[PDB]
């Protein structure tokens, strides 16, 4: 019934709010957060399926929206469970570290920590400067395994190396093409500058 969904939604939302207020650094609490986000999405999807457009006067999203959010929550929950069973479980882990905002930032689909700004100035114009996020710790999860890799910077973009394979998750030429008349830029990644390594014409 609608009544049962309402009651479950309350307790569910209360638990989520409690996590927000606690701001825990224990990974176990973040697994519990995502498990409740996952249940909340299923509740809203069922409410919509049953023809309700609000629940306790909160908007009930369309089916497609609640399903997409559910799939995100499930993926994050299972990823954090894999990390909890790994050697990295006892590290500090914040709600921001395990947020969808971080997870979907390039490289997408990865829990990441210790982000910092890399600035790229295109063709010598201050107004034509892009800001990107690099990460010292990128957690690559495949199946039940986790490996941490370091985000690295060179003239061409931001990359990591996993199992000997170099994968760029930002390529600065993509924004050069969009914003600039040139393929010449300067990369600032914190105290030093990376300049065009090749001849210029």
């Amino acid at each position: 019934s609608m009544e049962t969904l309402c009651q479950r939604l309350n307790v569910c939302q209360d638990k989520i709010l409690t996590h927000y207020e606690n701001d825990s650094t224990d990974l176990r609490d973040h697994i519990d957060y995502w498990k409740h986000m996952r249940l909340e999405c299923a509740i809203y999807y069922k409410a919509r399926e049953m023809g309700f457009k609000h629940i306790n006067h909160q908007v009930v999203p369309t089916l497609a929206v609640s399903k997409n959010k559910a799939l995100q929550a499930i993926e994050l929950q299972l990823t954090l469970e894999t990390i909890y069973n790994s050697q990295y479980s006892n590290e500090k882990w914040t709600l921001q570290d395990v947020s969808l905002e971080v997870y979907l930032t390039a490289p997408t689909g990865c829990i990441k920590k210790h982000g910092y700004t890399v600035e790229v100035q295109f063709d010598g114009d201050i107004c034509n400067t892009m800001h990107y996020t690099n990460w010292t710790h990128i957690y690559i999860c495949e199946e039940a395994s986790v490996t941490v890799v370091e985000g690295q910077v060179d003239y061409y973009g931001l990359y990591y190396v996993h199992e000997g394979i170099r994968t760029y998750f930002v390529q600065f030429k993509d924004d050069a093409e969009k914003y600039s008349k040139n393929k010449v830029w300067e990369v600032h990644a914190g105290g030093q500058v990376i300049l065009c390594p090749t001849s210029v014409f």
């Binding site: 969904l5 996952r38 999405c41 299923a42 509740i43 069922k46 559910a70 799939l71 499930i74």
Partner: peptide, 20 residues
């Protein structure tokens, strides 16, 4: 055999007794 299947499972059991 992936994540969409867990969502389907969650929806089916929403009014069933909780085991997990």
């Amino acid at each position: 055999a992936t994540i969409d299947m867990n969502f389907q499972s969650d929806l089916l059991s929403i009014f069933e007794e909780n085991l997990f």
